[PDB]
Amino acid sequence: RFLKVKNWETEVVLTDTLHLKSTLETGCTEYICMGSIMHPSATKDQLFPLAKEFIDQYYSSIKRFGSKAHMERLEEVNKEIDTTSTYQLKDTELIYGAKHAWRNASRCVGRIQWSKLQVFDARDCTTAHGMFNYICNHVKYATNKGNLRSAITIFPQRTDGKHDFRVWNSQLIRYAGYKQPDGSTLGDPANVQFTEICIQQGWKPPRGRFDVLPLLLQANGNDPELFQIPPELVLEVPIRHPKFEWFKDLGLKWYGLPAVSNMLLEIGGLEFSACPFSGWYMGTEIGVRDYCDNSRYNILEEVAKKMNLDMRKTSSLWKDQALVEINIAVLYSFQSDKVTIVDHHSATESFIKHMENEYRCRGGCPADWVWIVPPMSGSITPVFHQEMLNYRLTPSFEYQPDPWNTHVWK
Amino acid sequence: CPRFLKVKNWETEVVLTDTLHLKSTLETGCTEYICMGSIMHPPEDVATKDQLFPLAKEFIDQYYSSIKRFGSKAHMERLEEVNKEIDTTSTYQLKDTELIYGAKHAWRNASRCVGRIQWSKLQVFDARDCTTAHGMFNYICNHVKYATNKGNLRSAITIFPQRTDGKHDFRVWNSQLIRYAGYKQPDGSTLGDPANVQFTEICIQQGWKPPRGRFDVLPLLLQANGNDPELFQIPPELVLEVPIRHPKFEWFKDLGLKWYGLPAVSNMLLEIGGLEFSACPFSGWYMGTEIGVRDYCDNSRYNILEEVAKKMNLDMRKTSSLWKDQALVEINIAVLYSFQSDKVTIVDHHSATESFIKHMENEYRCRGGCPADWVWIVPPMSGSITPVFHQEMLNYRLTPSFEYQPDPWNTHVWK
Numbered sequence: 001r002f003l004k005v006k007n008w009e010t011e012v013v014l015t016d017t018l019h020l021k022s023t024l025e026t027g028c029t030e031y032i033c034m035g036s037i038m039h040p041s042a043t044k045d046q047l048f049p050l051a052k053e054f055i056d057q058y059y060s061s062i063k064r065f066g067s068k069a070h071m072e073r074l075e076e077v078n079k080e081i082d083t084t085s086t087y088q089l090k091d092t093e094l095i096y097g098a099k100h101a102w103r104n105a106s107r108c109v110g111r112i113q114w115s116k117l118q119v120f121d122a123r124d125c126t127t128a129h130g131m132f133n134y135i136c137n138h139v140k141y142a143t144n145k146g147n148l149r150s151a152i153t154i155f156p157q158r159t160d161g162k163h164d165f166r167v168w169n170s171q172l173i174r175y176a177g178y179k180q181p182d183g184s185t186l187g188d189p190a191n192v193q194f195t196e197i198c199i200q201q202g203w204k205p206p207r208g209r210f211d212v213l214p215l216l217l218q219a220n221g222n223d224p225e226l227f228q229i230p231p232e233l234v235l236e237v238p239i240r241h242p243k244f245e246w247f248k249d250l251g252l253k254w255y256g257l258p259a260v261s262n263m264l265l266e267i268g269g270l271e272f273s274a275c276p277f278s279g280w281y282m283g284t285e286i287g288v289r290d291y292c293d294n295s296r297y298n299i300l301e302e303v304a305k306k307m308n309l310d311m312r313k314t315s316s317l318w319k320d321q322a323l324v325e326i327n328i329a330v331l332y333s334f335q336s337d338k339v340t341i342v343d344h345h346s347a348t349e350s351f352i353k354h355m356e357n358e359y360r361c362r363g364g365c366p367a368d369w370v371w372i373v374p375p376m377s378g379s380i381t382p383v384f385h386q387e388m389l390n391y392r393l394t395p396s397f398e399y400q401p402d403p404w405n406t407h408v409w410k
Numbered sequence: 411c412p413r414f415l416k417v418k419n420w421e422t423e424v425v426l427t428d429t430l431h432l433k434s435t436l437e438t439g440c441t442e443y444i445c446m447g448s449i450m451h452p453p454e455d456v457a458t459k460d461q462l463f464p465l466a467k468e469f470i471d472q473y474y475s476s477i478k479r480f481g482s483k484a485h486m487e488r489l490e491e492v493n494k495e496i497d498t499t500s501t502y503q504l505k506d507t508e509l510i511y512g513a514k515h516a517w518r519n520a521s522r523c524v525g526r527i528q529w530s531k532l533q534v535f536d537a538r539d540c541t542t543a544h545g546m547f548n549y550i551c552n553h554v555k556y557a558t559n560k561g562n563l564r565s566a567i568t569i570f571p572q573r574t575d576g577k578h579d580f581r582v583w584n585s586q587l588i589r590y591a592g593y594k595q596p597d598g599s600t601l602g603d604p605a606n607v608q609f610t611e612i613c614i615q616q617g618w619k620p621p622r623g624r625f626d627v628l629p630l631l632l633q634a635n636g637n638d639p640e641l642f643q644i645p646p647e648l649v650l651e652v653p654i655r656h657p658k659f660e661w662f663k664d665l666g667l668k669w670y671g672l673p674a675v676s677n678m679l680l681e682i683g684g685l686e687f688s689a690c691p692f693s694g695w696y697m698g699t700e701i702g703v704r705d706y707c708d709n710s711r712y713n714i715l716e717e718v719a720k721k722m723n724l725d726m727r728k729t730s731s732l733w734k735d736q737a738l739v740e741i742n743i744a745v746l747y748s749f750q751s752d753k754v755t756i757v758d759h760h761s762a763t764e765s766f767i768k769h770m771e772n773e774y775r776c777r778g779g780c781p782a783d784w785v786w787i788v789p790p791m792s793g794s795i796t797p798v799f800h801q802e803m804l805n806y807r808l809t810p811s812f813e814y815q816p817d818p819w820n821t822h823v824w825k
């Protein structure tokens with residue numbers, strides 16, 4: 001069936017046909033919706049239909065479906081699976097695949113940018129040192145002195161599962177977190193465990209509030225190895241406020257480059273367990289979640305104090321006031337330093353225009369309202385009033401288990 | 411379907427186990443391949459005899475199970491009597507105890523409601539003896555006066571006769587018992603509340619003389635026993651209102667805003683044991699953001715963000731200054747302050763969401779689950795700094811339930 005989605009602000013109605021193409025499951029059933037669950041629950045014979053599906057849509061995309069090149073590619077891929085239990089993507093295919101995993105990422109509000117993705121092919125990498133070099137080149141290219149550029153670096157595909165490439169970091173650039181004797185936490189609490197693993201593996205921690213973590217890199221299933229990203233490659237922004245001169249005294253800072261490194265990229269049945277991808281920040285990622293989550297830096301108290309707000313009763317909305325001032329500061333700081341950042345109004349507005357684009361040229365756009373709507377000021381952004389259909393298309397980015405739960409060492 | 415489903419809270423690491431989803435009765439709209447969780451809503455005939463039997467049994471079973479009399483003589487006798495009623499009259503009547511139980515549970519089962527910790531405290535008014543629109547007016551006035559209670563609001567529901575053949579429906583045409591009029595102008599602008607322009611137009615056609623102001627309380631438009639609906643003015647002394655002012659900003663009162671104290675939704679259908687109560691106005695008290703974010707700051711509503719921001723002398727040239735967010739907070743501060751000052755019950759979104767988490771935990775423990783719609787439960791501002799943002803939720807449909815129904819002017823056969 002054709003499915004309609006309505007914007008209750010603009011009364012615009014879109015018709016979704018694209019969902020008919022999806023084959024992966026969402027987790028919901030006719031009787032139970034699991035839309036707010038974070039993660040709802042190969043062989044030769046499995047592999048070829050997935051390969052064929054992907055090759056077909058690639059040649060469909062370049063308007064050469066059923067061509068000589070198409071026919072021959074199908075042939076080629078089948079001999080390669082038969083004789084080696086897997087196959088290799090052409091470079092064009094790799095690029096097509098990576099862009100479309102981004103395009104299909106229902107939880108990403110930044111997808112208007114999807115076809116502007118710099119794809120670095122690192123499938124010839126064999127060691128952790130090689131991984132480090134590739135990652136440094138990625139970071140340097142994507143940072144571009146503040147004029148951030150979207151990029152993905154793709155390491156060799158999974159083979160037998162015992163020879164995985166993995167970036168153990170969840171992002172290429174993150175701050176360490178230290179569990180105090182106090183019982184409290186210095187730095188970023190989200191990373192306390194990873195930090196402990198780095199220390200255990202020989203990393204000498206500065207024990208500051210914003211210590212950049214080392215890279216911890218696993219090549220071909222071997223034990224991971226530690227590397228320091230050269231400091232000059234790590235662009236950082238000191239957070240100050242355009243009116244509160246005391247804000248700089250808080251000593252806050254953050255890094256310019258968000259580069260997620262712990263997801264899995266799947267294309268045509270092949271699995272890329274190491275594929276760090278990066279873009280630029282939406283301000284709330286830092287200002288709302290990274291700084292104000294109770295389980296994160298948790299600075300609301302300190303700010304509201306410096307703002308001399310009455311914090312006895314919750315109905316004074318002192319938290320809400322402090323939250324807005326923090327996000328103002330973050331946006332102002334990045335902008336003053338000419339580091340690319342987008343506010344949640346501009347981003348969601350861009351996403352609405354993107355949905356309209358996709359419905360017109362593609363027959364729909366999979367989108368996850370729970371993640372698309374920003375973590376503050378929800379209903380005064382246009383996505384709040386936008387009905388969305390969430391479904392799973394491939395190529396995709398998938399979650400995978402943390403390496404320290406699978407890997408067995410020396 | 412799996413017997414045990416787990417939900418996690420990503421802030422506290424607490425994991426809860428849901429078994430209640432097994433009692434799910436209706437569909438959600440979702441499938442294995444698509445999720446419709448952000449769709450707002452995923453013939454004039456009635457339940458046949460054969461349709462009605464198992465629906466009634468299911469409900470009667472559940473009622474006798476709740477009073478710890480399952481399998482009792484009284485339980486079996488009640489089943490027999492209901493069955494005979496359905497067989498001889500193709501419908502049946504609920505006992506007062508059952509009616510009260512059913513209403514309370516429709517609320518308990520309402521996945522989109524953040525206020526459900528209060529579900530067992532609901533004054534139920536039985537109006538199944540009502541025959542006319544004047545009588546409906548009488549019941550509604552008594553409902554309003556009771557629930558308002560001079561600002562100390564008390565949750566209540568008034569239940570009018572159930573549907574029979576569908577040509578004798580009782581309906582409140584209003585969407586809430588108390589709402590302000592909206593007037594479209596010839597120049598295309600709107601006076602009052604833009605959400606209510608269509609209903610306002612219907613009232614004016616029905617004979618209502620409109621004051622044409624910014625905050626004109628609408629008349630009740632009341633349909634009894636399938637007859638043409640009739641207009642009634644709610645006695646102004648029964649309509650509690652709060653003028654909105656701000657603790658710091660003296661100029662805020664000059665904006666001339668006010669709102670009414672009693673939120674009383676009147677266009678939903680109450681479904682119990684297969685019976686349909688098409689007129690069942692229910693009321694509680696407000697969460698601040700219902701007024702301060704949606705009513706006032708929605709673009710298609712009163713839309714005051716600009717005027718507030720201008721009086722705050724905010725830089726409104728670039729969105730990245732977050733002038734909208736700044737203004738939104740002050741407005742919501744004003745709403746909570748004005749209600750508290752006038753001693754009219756209201757709850758802020760931090761307190762409400764914290765109570766909902768405690769409520770949800772309790773329901774998982776005592777009931778085996780709590781259906782919840784994250785998309786509606788999370789408040790329209792400051793989402794992630796409330797504890798429901800990080801709380802995984804399962805959504806499913808239990809009966810008794812509150813349901814959407816078509817607007818009555820779309821289906822009514824005018825006499």
Ligand code: HEM
Binds near residue numbers: 278
């Ligand atoms: C270019 C600017 C971009 C912006 C502003 C942006 C914005 C966002 C935001 C705000 C989120 C939610 C993050 C969270 O709350 O944890 C997100 C999720 C996501 N983004 Fe984007 N993004 C951008 C680029 C990209 C790129 C280049 C990729 C991949 C090639 C990508 C893939 C994803 C994926 C896969 C998710 C969801 C991951 C999950 O399911 O947990 N994004 N994005």
Ligand code: HEM
Binds near residue numbers: 517694757786
């Ligand atoms: C006692 C204080 C109450 C509070 C603070 C409260 C709060 C809320 C809020 C904020 C919403 C979302 C409304 C929206 O955004 O449109 C809601 C929805 C809802 N409430 Fe409650 N409520 C209360 C009482 C009640 C009562 C007494 C009932 C019925 C007996 C009820 C039944 C419902 C239903 C069915 C919805 C969903 C309506 C829909 O699906 O459109 N609530 N509530």
Ligand SMILES: CN[C@H](C)Cc1cc(C#N)cc(OCc2ccc3c(C)cc(N)nc3c2)c1
Binds near residue numbers: 260262279
């Ligand atoms: C506490 N929040 C947790 C870490 C949720 C999360 C998990 C994973 C994984 N695996 C990956 C995640 O990535 C979100 C994401 C991914 C890519 C992004 C890019 C490329 C840019 C950007 N501005 N934000 C992103 C945000 C998030």
Ligand SMILES: CN[C@H](C)Cc1cc(C#N)cc(OCc2ccc3c(C)cc(N)nc3c2)c1
Binds near residue numbers: 673694696815
């Ligand atoms: C413009 N948005 C529309 C009006 C959404 C909506 C539709 C319907 C219906 N039918 C019913 C709705 O009810 C929400 C509701 C219901 C009862 C409430 C009670 C009893 C108290 C309270 N504070 N809010 C409520 C909020 C909402």
Ligand SMILES: C[C@H](O)[C@H](O)[C@H]1CNc2nc(N)[nH]c(=O)c2N1
Binds near residue numbers: 384447450787
């Ligand atoms: C499109 C979206 O489903 C729609 O705007 C919903 C979102 N969440 C909501 N949540 C509440 N509480 N009230 C609403 O009216 C809505 N609207």
Ligand SMILES: C[C@H](O)[C@H](O)[C@H]1CNc2nc(N)[nH]c(=O)c2N1
Binds near residue numbers: 035036370371
């Ligand atoms: C339980 C809930 O699904 C979880 O907190 C989600 C909600 N929405 C989110 N939305 C975004 N953008 N990022 C998140 O991490 C989350 N967390």
Ligand SMILES: [Zn+2]
Binds near residue numbers: 028029440
């Ligand atoms: Zn769903």
